[PDB]
Amino acid sequence: DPLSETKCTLKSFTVEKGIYQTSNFRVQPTESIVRFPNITNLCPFDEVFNATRFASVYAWNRKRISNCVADYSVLYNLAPFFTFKCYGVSPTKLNDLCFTNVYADSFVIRGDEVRQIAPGQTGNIADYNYKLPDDFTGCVIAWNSNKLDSKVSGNYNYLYRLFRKSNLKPFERDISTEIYQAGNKPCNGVAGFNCYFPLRSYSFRPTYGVGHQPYRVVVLSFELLHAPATVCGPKKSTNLVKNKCVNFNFNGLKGTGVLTESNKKFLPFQQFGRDIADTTDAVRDPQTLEILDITPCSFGGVSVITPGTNTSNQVAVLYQGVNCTEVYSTGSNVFQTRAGCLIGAEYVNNSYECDIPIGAGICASYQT
Amino acid sequence: EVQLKQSVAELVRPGASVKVSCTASGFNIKNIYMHWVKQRPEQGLDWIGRIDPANGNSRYAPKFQDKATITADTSSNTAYLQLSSLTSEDTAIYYCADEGWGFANWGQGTLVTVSA
Amino acid sequence: AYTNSFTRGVYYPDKVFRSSVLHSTQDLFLPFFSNVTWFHVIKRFDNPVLPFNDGVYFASIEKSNIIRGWIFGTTLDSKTQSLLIVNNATNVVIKVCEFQFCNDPFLDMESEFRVYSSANNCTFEYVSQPFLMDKNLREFVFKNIDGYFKIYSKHTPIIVREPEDLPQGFSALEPLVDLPIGINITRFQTLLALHRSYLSSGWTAGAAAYYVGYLQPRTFLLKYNENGTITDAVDCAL
Amino acid sequence: TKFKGLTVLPPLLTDEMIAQYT
Amino acid sequence: DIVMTQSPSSLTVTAGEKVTMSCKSSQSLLNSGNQKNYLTWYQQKVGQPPKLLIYWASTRDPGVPDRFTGSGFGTDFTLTISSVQAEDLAVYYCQNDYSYPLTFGAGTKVEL
Ligand SMILES: *[C@@H]1O[C@H](CO)[C@@H](O[C@@H]2O[C@H](CO)[C@@H](O)[C@H](O)[C@H]2NC(C)=O)[C@H](O)[C@H]1NC(C)=O
Ligand SMILES: *[C@@H]1O[C@H](CO)[C@@H](O)[C@H](O)[C@H]1NC(C)=O
Ligand SMILES: *[C@@H]1O[C@H](CO)[C@@H](O)[C@H](O)[C@H]1NC(C)=O
Ligand SMILES: *[C@@H]1O[C@H](CO)[C@@H](O)[C@H](O)[C@H]1NC(C)=O
Secondary structure, rough: OOOHHHHHHHHHOOOOOEEEEEEEOOOOOOOEEEOOOOOOOOOOHHHHOOOOOOOOOOOOOOEEOOOEEEOOOHHHOOOOOOOOOEEOOOOHOOOOOOOOOEEEEEEEEEEEHOOOOOOOOOOOOOOOOOOOOOOEEEEEEEEEEEHOOOOOOOOOEEEEEEOOOOOOOOOOOOOOOOOOOOOOOOOOOOOOOOOOOOEOOEOOOHOOOOOOOOOEEEEEEOOOOOOOOOOOOOOOOOOOOOOEEEEEOOOOOOOEEEEEEOOOOOOOOOEEEEOOOOEEEEEEOOOOOOOOEOOOOOOOEEEEOOOOOOHHHHHHHHEEEOOOOOOOOOOOOOEEEEEEEEEEOOOOOOOOOHHHHHHEEEEOOOOO | OOOOEEOOOOOOOOOOOOOOOOEEOOOOOOOOOOEEEEEOOOOEEEEEEEOOOOOOOOOOHHHHHOOOEEEEOOOHHHHEEEEEOOOOOOEEEEOOOOOOOOOOOOOOOEEEEEEE | EEOOOOOOOEEEEOEOOOOOOOOEEEEOOOOOOEEEEEEEEEOOOOOOOOOOOOEEEEEEEEOOEEEEEEEEEEOOOOOEEEEEEEEEOOOEEEEOOOOOOEEEEEEEOOOOEEEEEEOOOEEEEEEEOOOOOOOEEEEEEEEOOEEEEEEEEEEOOOOOOOOOOOOOOOOEEEEEEEOOOOOOOEEEEEEOOOOOOOOOOOOOOOOOOEEEOOOEEEEEEEEOOOOOHHHHHEOOOO | OOOOOOOOOOOOOOOOHHHHHO | OEEEEEEEOOEEEOOOEEEEEEEEHHHHOOOOOOOOOOOEEEEEOOOOOOEEEEEOOEEOOOOOOOOOOOOOOOOOOEEOOOOOOOOOOOEEEEEEOOOOOOOOOOOOOEOO
């Protein structure tokens, strides 16, 4: 109890009349809040998913995207997706951790040829149209698009280059339309029995069967370099808490305190504020554009007001410089003054000479 | 492509700790929060837990609580196993995981048993 | 031709709000009352390749909007990455690639980009609201610290341009946009849109004059008002 | 004409009481 | 923690004989956002580490790809193989994924 704390701090079994500072009142953070500015721009993976005509397998479109927040959660949320196999990276860790740049390649190919477009796997089309490097870190997204990309008559929009003179370089797209010299006799630009044109036309039809239907296949390439990383998943955010002492993480400021609305007006470029002593005084909420004042958690000295143990064993506790809305247990004749909020003493309007000085004109005493 | 190497099996004194390393080759471990699993010969497979390279916050199976601990080091893509005072039946072959939709990448396996 | 930088080129060092605070910060600044190179243009091609050094305090008072971007780069060659800033009336563009910069880079209404002969290893591309348009002083500070390319802006309207010298008033430069770009920069060149006549009776550039100053490590005592803006400053080593 | 453990205690005599003495 | 019961029946059959293997999954696991359920199967050749056989309970990964369709609402999923050969001769475990407590399959073998 406070009286025994006073006895220990005085190292005497009898404490004389007076006020003794025994301990320190401290308010610990109840909650922890983390905020980052929300999505705003979004990296358009759905756009290359939603492209009406996917690029040719040999002339695969290379889309390098940077400086945007990427939402990979919608990719898992999307039901029509059928294949999400990943190599060197967790499918669900794209949101958690990020790379510097992302390459998206959109192409339409038959179902059996989808497995041919994979690292460490070579195919009749893959070796000459699109050969994924063995060691790249990325995910291949594939799904059936027979209804969207085929008709009863037949879809000949998508074609591939069957014959190529040399092995394809990694991350290289071949757009050459030269007639392949399959035969020993020179082609000279004229199709013949020996010379076969490398490009062949697929026919996509619903009746053509599964394993050969068109598949909208998108491969995402992630590479992290010395340059700063600009595309990342949505970092965790929490709700805003006002008038309660909480740990706050406003884009990595990492401070503790109680957050209140402030009348101060920041400049548009400015993010947080500092006082004369170079202490964070106000922060702007990244989610909104409002300005939040940061005042520290309430703390102060705990002083025990006691008459002599010869007189009595009752004690009144003073919490210096603390609003006792934030605070012997409260509810026992709790009275508030400038020196602090006094617990255990009842304010009396009549005035006597000072007995135990509390502060700011308030003096405690033991009387009936 | 992407390979996870298991540490060679070390004979361990009875009632002591045993450590097995799962280093990643061909790719940094930073993008992978690998999972540890234990398999006993002629017995069902079990899931030990997982490690994240940064803020690892490893969460273990309820049966293995307070006795099975696993950690990894981001530098050199190394991982580790921490298991001590294992009985012969409890000891099982440990594998690493790709934590995908299914565990695509698995270690070659470590047959570790208390033999001293 | 030279002109004194009478308390010009001061920018907000950081994004920290301060109210009625005299904050003394040590950062790369244009020293007060310092020598500033001043160039005239115009065909009379005068666009020297000025070294970037720590930074550049670019300025212009062209009421005809003659200034149409800047050129940056370590060597202005395809071997190294370079900055390209082109600012159109409808929309501005910032491209960062290994541009092979021609002898006379310019924009061709604008029909086709004619600023770079080659575009390989393109890593960065940015688009924002126009800033060079809307007789008035248009002063910028460019920096390259820790791989972040920093730009500051302030469009002060000045009633008098007859003396053809920078005003003696003070105006701190609010940051406009910062670009994450890890390359190094050791050269600077200014862009002017050369029209079909150059491709020059149709297009006139008689009023295009731009002042260039170089930043230096200095200690400044910045005065913030209760609103949070820098109203005045002093250079401790002046 | 500071919350790092620095607490400024109020004087026992308020300015009104000092003025009343005066 | 999720209750699982995998049929360990082993059939010594010639190639071209279908086999049906299913294991119950309690709580009827259902991923939010997408209709797909996170249930997977593994194929482990004797003396070799297990590898991903099937994921999402209805999607066939590249690598010996053939059918393996499974129909269920999270209460149960059935994995079917059209033909049995030495390559498919292995031990299979079905492990739930949507539920964070992961319990692996008891084990199922096939013979030629
Ligand atoms: C194609 O565009 C449509 C229309 O925007 C997308 O449909 C929704 O996209 C939002 C993206 O924020 C998702 O949150 C919704 O769940 C989508 N709803 C449906 C019914 O799809 C669609 O995702 C885009 N991509 C594809 C492949 O269709
Ligand atoms: C955050 O999202 C809300 C809801 O869509 C939006 O009103 C707000 O503008 C977003 N934040 C910013 C900084 O735009
Ligand atoms: C805190 O104390 C002040 C006086 O010091 C008082 O006016 C106020 O009502 C108290 N409570 C709150 C919530 O501010
Ligand atoms: C800052 O805001 C106050 C309050 O309206 C205003 O009186 C003052 O002029 C403003 N200062 C500037 C520089 O905008």
